[PDB]
Amino acid sequence: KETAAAKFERQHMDSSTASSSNYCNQMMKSRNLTKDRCKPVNTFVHESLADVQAVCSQKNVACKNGQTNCYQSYSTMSITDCRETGSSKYPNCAYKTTQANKHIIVACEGNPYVPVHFDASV
């Protein structure tokens, strides 16, 4: 079974760095987020894996689900928000791509202690 950490990397890491309007259409397809359904909302982080994993050593904050293993990045990070358009219809999943620089909040667990869930961008 895919680990939670591996799932986080597949769903949310794109360290190669989004300039195009079609970025989300291609990425969402390439990360298997459109196979059975259009994942409506997703965020990709364009920092190194090492910088993102380091967030697990930064600001401890509550998770939306009430657990206490969430962490906010001290710095802002280059991210892209992908949100399915109002007219998007599976299997032709269409997304709006929005670039931003925001702090991320992830849940961390395991050994190595790394992100396993994307909680929010702030």
Report the catalytic residues: 12, 117
**Count of beta carbons in the 10 Å neighbourhood of residue 119:** 19
Residue corresponding to tokens 């360290």 = 15
Q: Residue 42 interacts with ligand URI (CB under 6 A)?
A: yes
Is-contact 99 18, C-beta < 8 A? yes
Number of residues that bind ligand URI (CB under 6 A): 9
The reply, when asked if residue 64 is annotated as ligand binding, is yes
First CA to last CA across the chain, in angstroms?
31
CB of 21 to ligand URI, least distance (A): 19
16 or 65, CB closer to a copy of itself? 16
**Secondary structure element (H or E) that encloses residue 26, with its range:** helix 23-30
CB of 79 to ligand URI, least distance (A): 8
Of 25, 43, 73, 97, the one binding ligand URI by CB under 6 A: 43
Tokens of 109: 């667990």
Cross-strand partners of 121: 104
Residues that bind ligand URI (CB under 6 A): 11, 41-43, 81, 117-118, 120-121
Please report, in range form, the residues annotated as the binding site for substrate: 7, 10, 39-43, 64, 83
